Design a protein around this nucleic acid. Sequence first.
RNA 1: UACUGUAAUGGACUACCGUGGCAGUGACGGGUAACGGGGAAUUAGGGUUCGAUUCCGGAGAGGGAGCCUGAGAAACGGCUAC
RNA 2: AGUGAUUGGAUGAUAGGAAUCCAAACCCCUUUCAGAGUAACAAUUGGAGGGCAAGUCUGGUGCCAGCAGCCGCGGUAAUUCCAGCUCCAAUAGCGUAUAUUAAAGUUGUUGCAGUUAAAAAGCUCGUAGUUGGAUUUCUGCUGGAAGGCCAAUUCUAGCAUCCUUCUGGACUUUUACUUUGAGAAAAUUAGAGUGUUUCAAGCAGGCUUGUCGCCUUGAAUACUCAGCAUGGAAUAAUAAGAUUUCGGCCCUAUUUUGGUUUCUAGGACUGAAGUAAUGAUUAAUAGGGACGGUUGGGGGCAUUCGUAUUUAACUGUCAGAGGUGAAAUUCUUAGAUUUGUUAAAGACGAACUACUGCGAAAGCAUUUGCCAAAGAUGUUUUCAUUAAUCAAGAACGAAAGUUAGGGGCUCGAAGACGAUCAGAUACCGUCGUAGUCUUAACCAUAAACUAUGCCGACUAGAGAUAGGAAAACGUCAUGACUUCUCCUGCACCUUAUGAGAAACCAAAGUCUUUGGGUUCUGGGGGGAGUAUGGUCGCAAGGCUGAAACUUAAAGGAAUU
Lengths: 38, 79, 135, 129, 150
Amino acid sequence: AHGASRYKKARAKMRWKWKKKRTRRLQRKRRKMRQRSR
Amino acid sequence: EIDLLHPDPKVEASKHKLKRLIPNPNSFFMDVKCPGCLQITTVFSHAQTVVLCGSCNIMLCQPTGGKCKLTEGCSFRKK
Amino acid sequence: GKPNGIRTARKLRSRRRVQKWADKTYKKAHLGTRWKANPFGGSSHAKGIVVEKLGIEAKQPNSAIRKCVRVQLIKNGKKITAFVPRDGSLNYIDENDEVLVAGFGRSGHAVGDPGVRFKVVKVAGASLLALFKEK
Amino acid sequence: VRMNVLADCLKTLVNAEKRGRRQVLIRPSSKVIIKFLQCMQRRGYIGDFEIVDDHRAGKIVIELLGRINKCGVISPRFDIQVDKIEQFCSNLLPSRQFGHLVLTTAYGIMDHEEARRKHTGGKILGYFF
Amino acid sequence: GRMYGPGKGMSASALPWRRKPPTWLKIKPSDVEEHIAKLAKKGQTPSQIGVTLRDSFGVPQVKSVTGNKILRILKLQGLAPELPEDLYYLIKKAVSVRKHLERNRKDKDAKFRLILVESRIHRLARYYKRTKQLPATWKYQSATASALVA
RNA sequence: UACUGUAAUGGACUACCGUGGCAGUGACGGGUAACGGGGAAUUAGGGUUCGAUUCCGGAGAGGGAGCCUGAGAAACGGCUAC
RNA sequence: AGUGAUUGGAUGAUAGGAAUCCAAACCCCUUUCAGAGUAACAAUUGGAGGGCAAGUCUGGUGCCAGCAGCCGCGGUAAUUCCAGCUCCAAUAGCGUAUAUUAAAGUUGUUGCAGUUAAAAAGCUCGUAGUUGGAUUUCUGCUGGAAGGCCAAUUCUAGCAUCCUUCUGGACUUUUACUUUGAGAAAAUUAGAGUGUUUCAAGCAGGCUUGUCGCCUUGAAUACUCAGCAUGGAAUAAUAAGAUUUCGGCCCUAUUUUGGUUUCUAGGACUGAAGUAAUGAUUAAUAGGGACGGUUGGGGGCAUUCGUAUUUAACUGUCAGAGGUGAAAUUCUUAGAUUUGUUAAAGACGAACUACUGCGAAAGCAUUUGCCAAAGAUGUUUUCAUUAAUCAAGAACGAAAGUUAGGGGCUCGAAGACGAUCAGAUACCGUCGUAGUCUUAACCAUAAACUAUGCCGACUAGAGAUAGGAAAACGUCAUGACUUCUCCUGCACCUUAUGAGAAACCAAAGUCUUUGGGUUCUGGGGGGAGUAUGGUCGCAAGGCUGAAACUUAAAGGAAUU
C-alpha cells in the first residue's frame, strides 16, 4: 500500500494522480475480460 | 516573596468567584423602598423576574444580564 | 497511548498477536508458505543431480562469469542453480553427477555479485575443499 | 475527566519544585494525599502544610524546601509481595541507598522501609527521591 | 468540556461558606414549607420554586432554613412530579423538534440535533431506572412522547 | 417424568412432554512440519523459543470393526471378518 | 631477563608380563622387563583493506580467472584473487549450512514510535470493553510481653462511655489484596555436608590392633495461576439507602408401647403501652436541566433587492470591430463594435472583508418575516455522580460523477477549427455538447491539513481582539468612547537550566529523574492499495486485503 505518503514524490517519479488512473484502466479491463469467460 | 496562605484583600476581590481561596458569592440582598408605599421588600441583587410590590403591584426592578435595574428614584439598602 | 489499567489484559495481549505479523522475519517463520516455498524441505542440506553446467554474469560494477550448476533435488525434482566455490572445479562436476547443496549462508535472499541462493558443498561425496587443496 | 486525585497533585508539586517556588497550593485534596505528604514529611523532604477547610474537597497549601528531585505515582496500583519490594526499587528508585517507595498496606500507608520490618506487602502507591 | 458541543464554559452559582444563614433573616422553617406546598399546587417545578423564593420573598436557600431540599419536601407532602424535571424538559424539547422536522424535512442541522437530545434521553433514563425514580420498564417512544408531556 | 442398560451415576438408551442450550470474554469451522506435563536452551529484571526422547499420565500395534477367557483386555509376540 | 639444532646429562604414548577387575573376557588403578634427541613419537583449522586481532613484503594474473556474510578488491605497479615467506586468533579441536536465543527499547506490561522520517479514522453519536471526584472511630495517656544496642523497632491490653448466646464461635455486608499455615512424587534446578587424585560427577564416607567397633552416621533444605484455611486498621470493588416489656394467634421435640390432653419449653405469624437526639453527608473552578438579558456571514422555509453578463427591441452615427508576444479562425455597410433608454432570462452577492465571527466537520456573506436549535456569560435556583473514551452499529460528509424531472445566463472536461513548433492531439486564440444552478434519490472519497486523536491537571509574561458580566462623583449625548478586573473564543509577539535529529514547538513542555484515563494506526524500500475471496454500490468505484519474486539502501532536517 502507501497510505498518506501515497504521493510523496521525494524523487523523480511518474506522478501519483496519473499512476492511479493508469491502474484503474488496467483494472477496469480485467473485469470485462474475466466476465467474458463466464 | 509569596503568601498563598494569607493573600491580599485587593487582589482576591478582583479574581473570579471560584478561583478565590474560599469561594463566596459577590451577589447580595437589598431592602428596597419604592416611592409610593412605606413598605419594604427583600430583593436579590441579580433578579431574573419582574418583582411586584407588597400590595397593588407597582414594579421594583426589571431583570437584565447581571444586576437588575431599579425603577427610577427608589432607594435600596444592602443587608 | 496504551491502556494502563489492571483489567486490560485482552487489549494488550490481542495487540501483540495481531501486530507481530507486521515484522518481516516473523512472517517467514510462522506462515504456512515456508513449507511450499524453498526447494529445500526446511532442511540444511540436500542432494541432487546436475542436469546442466551453467554460467552466469555478476551485476555491475563487478563483471565476470561465475560458473554455477543447475540441479534437481532428489526428493522434489525441483531445479535450482548452485554456485561452485573457488577457482575452477567446474571440470570436477560432470553432468549427471550427484552434488550436495548447502545454503549460501544468507537464508536464501541473494549473495554478492544474481539470483543464486545455493552452494555445492560436495561432488560425488569428495567435497570441494579436498580437491582444490588436492589433499 | 479527573481519575486520580493524587496523580494530579504530585505533578503540580514537582513542576513548581523545578521552577523553584517557596510554597504551592494543590486541589482538590484528600485523605490519601495528607497521609502521602505525612510520610514525605517524616523523612524531611517538605516542611509544614496547611489544609484549608473550605466547604468542598479542600485546598492543601504546602511549604516546601529545595529537596525533592522528583515524586511520582504508579497507576495502575500493582500488588507486591515482600519478596518483590526489592525487585521494584532496583528498577524504579535512583539508588539502593536513598529514596523511598511508598505503598498502602492493611497497617496504614507507609514507606517500603517500614513495610519490610512490619512484614506485610500491599498495593504500590507512588515514590519520591 | 460540556458533553456534546466543544464549548468549555465556566459559569456557575457559588454557594456561600456559612450555613443556616442569614443573621438578618427570620421567619420560620414551618412557614417556608407552606409556601413551597402552595406554589407546587399552583403547578410549578422544583427549580421554579427556589427562583420565586429568593427573588421576591426572603430565603437565599431552603437547605439553609429547613433541613431538607425542595424535592425532599415535595415528596414528603406528596405533591411531587410524575417524572423528574430534567427528563421532562429534554422530552418536551424532543417533541418540539419533531414538530419542526416533519414539517421541514430538508433541515439536516435539526436532524443532527434530534439525535443528540434523544441520545441523552436514553442514557439519562438509564440513570433514573437505577435510582428507582422511574417505573421499571419505562421507555422513550417517539409515538407516545407528545401526550406524556401535557 | 417413567422405564431400560451398566460395576454403578447420567440422553448412556427408549417412549411420551416442554422449547430450550452455546456465542463478540471468539461459539461453530480451518491450520499445526501438536501427544500433555514434570522439564530444556537463553548470562540484569520482564521475556522469547523448544519439550519424539530417562519419570508420571495418554493413545497405538499395517488400516478400520467385532469378540472369547478372566479380578482386570474391546489384548494383537489371543482369535473371527473385510 | 630473553635468544643461539653448540654440545650435555637427568616421564607415558607404545609393546608384553604380574596381580587386581569381570558371570567370562576388557578398560581403569597399582607394580614390572624393554621404551625420544632434528623429542621423525614432526598440530592442525581459519585468517592477515575495514568491520575484527595480523604484512604500504615478494613472484604470477590483467574487470580475465577468482575472492567477497556487508562495504568493496581485479581494466599491467592488486595492503583482498592464485602462490611463497612471516605474523595473528582459537587449539585436540577449528570452519561451513539450516533452525533458534541474546544483541532487538527493531513487537516495547516493565519499555518504542505516529507535525515534516513508517503511521491520528473527514467528522459527531454510541453499545459492550477499559477508567471513574471528595466524604463515614481519628487523636491522647497509663500498662504488659519482647527487643536490638551501646530508650529505638515489633506486637498487645486498658481507660475516654466498646457487642453479646455460653465455657474456644456466633455476630461485624461480601470478595479481591496481603500475611502466616496446610496439602502437593521423585529426577532435573538452586543448595548444606564430603579431597570421586583435580573435575564433570557420585551420595558417599570418616576415625581405629578392635571382634555384640564406634561417630545413639550421613544422604539437610528450598522450589512445586486455580483450589482449601487464617491474622489485618489501608487501598479498590460490592451490598444497603429497628429496639425494650405485655396477649390473642398458632405449629413442634425431650422425660415421667400406641391412642388420648393438657401442661410447660421453644418456634414463625398480628394488636396494646414505653424507650432512642427517632432515621436522608457535602453540592467538585465534574456533569445534566431550569431561569435572565444578549450574541452570531450556524440551519430550514418563504420574500425582496442590486448592478453586471448574454439575447431581443427600438434609437442614433458610420468602417472597421475581435483577439495576440505577433497574427489568423470569427463578426461586419441586409449597419457590426461603440452611444442611450427599456424589457426578459437565469446565475452570482463586489467595495465594506480583517493573521474577525458562527458551525461536529463538510461548510456558511443582499433585505425582511416566520420556524425550531446552539455556545459563552450572569445566577446565595434545581437534580446529586447521572461521567470520560469508545470494538460492533448509526447520522452528516466540498468538488467531480450517476439516476429521474425542471432550468440553461455565463463559464466550459470532450469535439471543432485558427496559431505556435522539427512535430504540438498542449500552453495562446475563437466557437462549443455534458456539466455548472434547483427538487428527489444515490455515491462516501480530497494536500477532507493544524499533514499534530479526545477528556483532565499543572507550568510565563506583555499588548491586541470577538462575546458576556461588574466597577468609575470618568468624557461627550438606554447607547458610543476612555480606564481597570473577570471568565470564554480565534490568534499573535517575546523567551526558556522545558523538549527536539534539526526545521521549529505554551505544546511537539512537565518522558531513562521513564506509569492521570482511553480510542485508532505503524515496523527497511518495492511488488501493491495490485491478485484472489468477501461485502456495500445502478455504475464509476468504496471498505477489507495477501503472496511468489525483488533490492542496499529508500526516507527526514539542516551545511558547503
